[PDB]
């Protein structure tokens, strides 16, 4: 009767709904009883420090478990042959065949083999021994403690920040651009130049010697003379064996481009020069805003003055400053949309341009990292649109936003939504129709009749960056071009070697199957956007429910009247778009993984011929690659893919269990539960035990969430088991 | 009384009381046990290289892995020499190498690691690194094995004459 | 929770005192016990074939718990089952771990309880505070000096145990 | 493995005692009225 102490409406509920709803509304601090704005921003600040610490404890845990139980020192000796160990297994349910089957990695105990790539990342950035992985784990435990104490400290009465501090947009932007983005990128260049570059070249540099070991033989004298090009002189040779002194140069900043020939990763001197460039740029960008000394920009002044004189945007951005600052949901939506695009950039640029030594030969790690970050990307992008819907319901004031960009977006909400409906339908009808055309014609024994459309626009883009496969002779592909001549002395020789060589995932060859799947991804991104945009724009009202704002973000329905109002809330369009997010990241990761496993065999033509129809995707990707995974255990034994073999079935179960919450709805279950309440009260020896909370069926919104969680968890666990076990079992 | 073969930490406790408040050991002695433990770990990883080279030679078609031999040299052999040079530095100049002259810097103005009684063993290990690399380029399996053995003998000899104080602390 | 004698209370001080005096006895007794080799087959590694996967340890040699460690654990399990039965079903006269919600918390002892040479509560609390401190002293001494806890117990008492 | 005893000591504690205890306490806290 007092668990949701933040909610008296839930704390007086006599049912089991109180526990569920108190657990599910716990982090929605804005909705808590008697919540002021001061207390809202100060609890968010302290709980952001708790998230900071959880991240640091998670990273310290990965470092500790690899330092303790991993084979990092064995792996760094021979990184292409040794399989990295994540942590050991102590499971009292194992049989002795299971214990023997997981005893890989060169150790004497069962282990999980790491798919996270942390070995390649820690190898590349300098770590050599278990002592420094452990030292990193210790330092992160200290930092986690520092940020937990900071979270407690900024909850103390003298140390409580005011709302004037929390909304100082200019000082926060100045410091996050110049200190958090820029100076830490500059400090990361210092780590590469001072530690990672020398230790990639055999010379150990630690805290014990880094003030008496110069990164460059000349040493901070060329920098303080303008002779900066002396830091690019004598780069690492193509004969360099990573981690050793043979083939090593003395340069610490280069723009060679392409990849280190042995590790098949970006040059660490390119990465050090990248973070130096991006650091200075971000530091300069962090001097943009006026704080205390009269130079800089006021964000209010910039936003108010950007109204085009033609009047096409109305009042423009007048009043957008206040809306953004006052609305934490508008900020969360901008932050999550921005972050979601970046983790999609992270997934796309880390497989094509890997930075870590001897990764991109760890095919399981490449598949897991790409799949992981694309799923994180889809979650962040859907959440951005969710919090835009929450912004419109909760924080958007139409009077304060008269004729703005925001009001005028709502004014044409139907033009936006109907054109997203058109483009979704357009793409879906044709992409599916071309795929079905191809399936029917191939089935009828006539593969030639297939509508195979070359991806010429993308091929032109590849050629424009120097791919010579398509013979476009555009820009970099043409030897005598202004673009080619300009970059010839700096990054083009390495880039042309990297792009033209077929040993890397840089600008991988694209054909008709690639075109069709890209259009499928376009239908998926447009359809998820349609559902999310329809939810955000119709969040505050619709013809079916004009006063939808008055009911909130997440409500079940408005009842069976007016024809029926199931899934009418903006939350329910989040709910419906979550399936479309899962479907699109499914199409993306299925495409990435199938194209890569076919290239990794040396059989890229198998994707080229089978991806243009859907039975090729069914038999040649899902059915063909299932066999190492589903044979992880059988009546003839088991091997170390048994865990993924069990997880794959576990994902199928959770996913299907989600269907129970999504297909079967409340009234059936409340009528079951009332017969169980009768039976418990009428059973002798059992009616001595009484519930404190009346058993009720799950709510309409709660069951939609429970089915969505089960569907999503089943989706993730099934695909993670498949993408890891098929790649591990195949090794290619 | 000795240092652990793998982790390199003090092994047993066995008025010079080990307990912190009553410890009679200097920070120099504690730095020396740290360096000696690191020397112990690097020297005891020499059998692992010897076993790997034997596996390479007895294979159906045998090739020396220059990458393995050079990466092992970079990871352990260079570390063994630097730890021994630091122990020689502390033995010769004294407290100054312990931070008495300040932060590690160029032109530290302290007596060099050479002119130490224990430096000759460091010269032996440096010759061993050169032989390990030369044999790896040559493809000589026996050369790598003997060179690693020379390093192992030199490091054990260093520790025996050093008699490092083991500070359990 | 706190209103039942749990937390930083004198009830908890007394109970942890009783457990630390017993623990000092058990540490001294196991030091004497394995010093003379009176634990049978102390080094013998238990086989997973008889005991199952709970016996696995992952120590490079043997891959199993030793028989000594299992025997000390079974001694602890005996007094844990006594502990659970005494916690849930105490004696009529015994002091109870979880006091009734409406109880009178005993006055805090202070820096030093009054000294009574008999089997008194004050004597129990004094010895209990000493034993809890003693547990910390031995655990830190063994940790700091890199010696087994059995060995530092033997060393403190002048090797009387073995 | 060094400290190989710790996985045998902690994994049952973290995996059985920790949930049991925190579930028991969570149950007491959610059900309690004052």
């Amino acid at each position: 009767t007092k668990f949701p102490k933040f909610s008296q409406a839930l704390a007086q509920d006599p049912a089991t709904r109180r526990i569920w709803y108190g657990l599910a509304t716990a982090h929605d601090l804005e909705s808590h009883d008697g919540m002021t704005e001061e207390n809202l921003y100060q609890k968010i600040f302290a709980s952001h420090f708790g998230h900071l610490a959880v991240i640091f404890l998670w990273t310290s845990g990965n470092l500790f478990h690899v330092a303790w139980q991993g084979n990092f020192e064995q792996w760094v000796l021979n990184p292409l042959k040794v399989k990295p160990i994540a942590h050991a297994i102590w499971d009292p349910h194992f049989g002795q065949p299971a214990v023997k089957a997981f005893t890989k990695g060169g150790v004497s105990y069962p282990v999980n083999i790491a798919t996270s790539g942390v070995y390649h990342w820690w190898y590349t950035i300098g770590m050599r021994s278990n002592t420094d992985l452990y030292a990193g784990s210790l330092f992160l435990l200290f930092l986690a403690g520092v940020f937990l104490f900071a979270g407690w400290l900024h909850l103390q009465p003298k140390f409580r920040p005011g709302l004037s501090w929390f909304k100082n947009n200019e000082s926060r932007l100045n410091h996050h651009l110049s200190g958090l983005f820029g100076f830490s990128s500059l400090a990361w260049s210092a780590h590469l130049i001072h530690v990672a570059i020398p230790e990639a070249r055999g010379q150990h540099v630690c805290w014990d010697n880094f003030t008496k070991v110069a990164p460059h033989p000349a040493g901070l004298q060329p920098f303080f003379t303008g002779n900066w090009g002396a830091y690019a002189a004598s780069p690492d040779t193509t004969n360099h064996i990573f981690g050793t002194s043979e083939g090593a140069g003395t340069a610490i900043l280069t723009f060679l481009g392409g990849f280190h020939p042995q590790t098949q990763a970006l040059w660490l001197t390119d990465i050090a020069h990248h973070h130096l460039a991006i650091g200075v740029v971000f530091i300069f960008a962090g001097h943009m805003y006026r704080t205390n000394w009269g130079i800089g920009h006021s964000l209010k002044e910039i936003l108010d003055a950007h109204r085009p004189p033609g009047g096409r945007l109305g009042a423009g951005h007048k009043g957008i400053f206040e809306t953004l600052t006052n609305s934490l949901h508008f900020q969360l939506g901008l932050a999550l949309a921005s972050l979601g695009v970046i983790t999609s950039l992270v997934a796309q640029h880390m497989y094509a341009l890997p930075s870590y030594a001897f990764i991109a030969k760890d095919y399981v790690t490449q598949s897991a990292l790409y799949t992981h970050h694309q799923y994180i990307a889809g979650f962040l992008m859907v959440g951005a649109f969710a919090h835009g819907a929450i912004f419109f319901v909760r924080d958007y004031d139409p009077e304060q936003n008269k004729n703005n960009v925001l009001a005028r977006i709502l004014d044409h909400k139907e033009a936006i939504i109907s054109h997203l409906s058109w483009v979704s339908l357009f793409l879906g009808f044709h992409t599916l129709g071309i795929y079905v055309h191809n399936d029917v014609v191939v089935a009828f024994g006539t593969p030639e009749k297939q509508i195979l459309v070359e991806p010429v626009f993308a091929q032109w883009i590849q050629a424009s960056s120097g791919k010579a496969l398509y013979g476009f002779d555009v820009l970099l592909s043409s030897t005598n071009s202004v673009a080619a001549n300009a970059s010839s002395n700096i990054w083009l020789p390495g880039w042309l070697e990297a792009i033209n060589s077929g040993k890397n995932s840089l600008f991988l060859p694209i054909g008709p199957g690639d075109f069709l799947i890209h259009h499928a991804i376009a239908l998926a991104l447009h359809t998820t956007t349609l559902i999310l945009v329809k939810g955000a724009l119709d969040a505050r009202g619709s013809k079916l429910m004009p006063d939808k704002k008055d009911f909130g973000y997440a409500f079940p329905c408005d009842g069976p009247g007016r024809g029926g109002t199931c899934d009418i809330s903006a939350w329910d369009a989040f709910y419906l778009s979550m399936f479309w997010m899962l479907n699109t990241i499914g199409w993306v990761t299925f495409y990435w993984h199938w194209k890569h496993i076919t290239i990794w065999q040396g059989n890229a033509g198998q994707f080229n011929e089978s991806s243009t129809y859907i039975m090729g995707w069914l038999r040649d990707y899902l059915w063909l690659n299932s066999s190492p995974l589903i044979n992880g255990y059988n009546p003839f034994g088991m091997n170390s893919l048994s865990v993924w073999s069990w997880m794959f079935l576990f994902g199928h179960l959770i996913w299907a269990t989600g269907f129970m919450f999504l297909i079967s709805w409340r009234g059936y279950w409340q009528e079951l539960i009332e017969t169980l309440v009768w039976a418990h009260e009428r059973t002798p020896l059992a009616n001595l035990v009484r519930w404190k909370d009346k058993p009720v069926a799950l709510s309409i919104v709660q069951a939609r969430l429970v089915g969505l969680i089960h569907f999503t968890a089943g989706y993730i666990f099934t695909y993670a088991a498949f993408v890891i076990a098929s790649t591990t079992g195949k090794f290619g | 009384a000795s240092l652990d073969p793998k982790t390199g930490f003090p092994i047993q406790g066995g008025s010079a009381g080990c307990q912190p408040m009553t410890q009679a050991a200097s920070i120099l002695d504690k730095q020396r046990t740290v360096l000696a433990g690191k020397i112990t770990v690097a020297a005891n990883k020499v059998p692992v290289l010897t076993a790997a080279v034997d596996k390479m030679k007895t294979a159906k078609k045998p090739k020396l892995d220059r990458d393995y031999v050079l990466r092992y040299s970079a990871l352990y052999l260079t570390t063994l020499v630097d730890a021994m040079e630091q122990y020689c530095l502390r033995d010769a100049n004294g407290a100054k190498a312990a931070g008495g002259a300040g932060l590690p810097k160029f032109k530290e103005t302290l007596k060099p690691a050479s002119s130490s009684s224990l430096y000759s063993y460091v010269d032996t290990v440096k010759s061993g690194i050169a032989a390990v690399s030369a044999a790896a380029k040559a493809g000589d399996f026996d050369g790598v094995n003997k060179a690693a053995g020379d390093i192992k003998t030199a490091a054990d000899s260093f520790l025996s004459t050093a008699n490092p104080p083991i500070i359990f602390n | 929770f706190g209103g039942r004698g749990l937390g930083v209370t004198v009830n908890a001080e007394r109970w942890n005192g009783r457990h630390a005096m017993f623990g000092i006895f058990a540490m001294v007794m196991t030091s004497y016990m394995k010093g003379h080799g009176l634990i049978p087959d102390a080094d013998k590694v238990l086989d997973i074939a008889q005991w199952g996967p709970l016996a696995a340890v992952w120590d490079g040699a043997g891959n199993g718990i030793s028989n000594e460690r299992a025997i000390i654990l079974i001694a602890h399990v005996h007094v844990l089952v006594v502990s659970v039965i005494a916690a849930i079903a105490p004696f009529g006269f015994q002091d109870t771990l979880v006091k009734e919600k409406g109880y009178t918390p005993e006055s805090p002892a202070g820096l030093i309880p009054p000294f009574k040479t008999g089997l008194t509560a004050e004597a129990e609390l004094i010895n209990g505070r000493l034993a809890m401190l003693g547990v910390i002293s031995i655990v830190t001494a063994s940790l700091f000096t890199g010696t087994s806890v059995v060995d530092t117990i033997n060393l403190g008492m002048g090797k009387i145990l073995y | 493995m060094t400290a190989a005893y710790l996985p045998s000591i902690l994994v049952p504690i973290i995996g059985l005692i920790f949930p049991g205890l925190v579930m028991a306490f969570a149950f007491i806290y959610i059900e309690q009225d004052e």
């Binding site: 302290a46 330092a67 403690g145 979270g151 | 930490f9 | - | 060094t2």
Partner: peptide, 30 residues
């Protein structure tokens, strides 16, 4: 390799982090 003493130092620092986590959670809960 990592000593048992090194693991114990890590466990000490994680206990300190646990106590600071309890203190932050109680402060956030009020």
């Amino acid at each position: 390799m990592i000593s048992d003493t090194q693991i114990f130092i890590a466990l000490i620092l994680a206990l300190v982090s646990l106590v600071l986590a309890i203190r932050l959670g109680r402060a956030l809960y009020q």
